[PDB]
């Protein structure tokens, strides 16, 4: 699913779920364990914001 057409300039880049890399399964054998990414999978547009050092969207007890 692309981003809605406009003037931003996404193009046909996929719109992926707005979720932090901290939410990915930590026990799975990722090709990039620190990023929790696999080689070849599409990277979220804002991945550099969703690395484990930055913005967390994990569920909270409250």
């Amino acid at each position: 699913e692309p981003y809605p057409d406009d003037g931003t300039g996404y193009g046909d880049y996929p719109k992926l779920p707005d979720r932090s890399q901290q939410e990915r399964d930590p026990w799975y054998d990722w090709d990039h364990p620190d990023l929790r990414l696999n080689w070849g999978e599409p990277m979220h547009w804002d991945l550099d914001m969703y690395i484990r050092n930055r913005v967390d969207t994990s569920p909270t007890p409250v």
Binding site: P26, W27, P61, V62
Partner: protein, 171 residues
């Protein structure tokens, strides 16, 4: 991806660990861990999978309400205090290739045995590729599982980076 049985067992383990974080004291934990086990055994034989799913769904909402906000985490588990602590000391094996010959001269026996492993890797590679090629359906693999070696004198395909991975306490 997860079956109903897998989801139930994961909740049971998860609830016990959070129950353990509330109780702290072993005798208190043992007592309440038995009551919790009893509740799971109260519906072990539910055959109606629609009712069974609702019981699982309601148990998950019950868990979310009663989870410990700061549960115990094993030190080296994800989110633990020692998680990833020793990654800075883990060095890949290919770095030894770039050692100066004077550094290599200090461990003559280690680097002799290292050449025997590199030779083993070189002479195994063509079989590993050809075994995977002839065991993979036309449309590529459907799962990430890898096969064992079939013949004697063969090594399981794609073994090098598992066998030679850094030690968990490498320094």
């Amino acid at each position: 991806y997860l079956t109903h049985q897998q989801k139930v067992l994961r909740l049971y383990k998860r609830a016990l660990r959070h129950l353990e974080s509330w109780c702290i004291h072993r005798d208190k934990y043992r007592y309440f861990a038995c009551l919790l086990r009893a509740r799971f055994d109260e519906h072990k034989n539910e055959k109606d999978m629609v009712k069974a799913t609702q019981l699982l769904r309601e148990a998950e909402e019950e868990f979310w309400h009663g989870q410990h906000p700061q549960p115990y985490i094993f030190p080296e588990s994800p989110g633990g205090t020692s998680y990833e602590r020793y990654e800075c000391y883990k060095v890949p094996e290919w770095c030894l290739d770039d050692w100066h010959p004077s550094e290599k001269a200090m461990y003559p026996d280690y680097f002799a045995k290292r050449e025997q492993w590199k030779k083993l890797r070189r002479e195994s590679w063509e079989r590993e590729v050809k075994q995977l090629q002839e065991e993979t359906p036309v449309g590529g693999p459907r799962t990430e599982a890898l096969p064992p070696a079939r013949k004697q004198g063969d090594l399981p395909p794609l073994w090098w980076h598992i066998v030679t991975r850094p030690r968990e306490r490498p320094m």
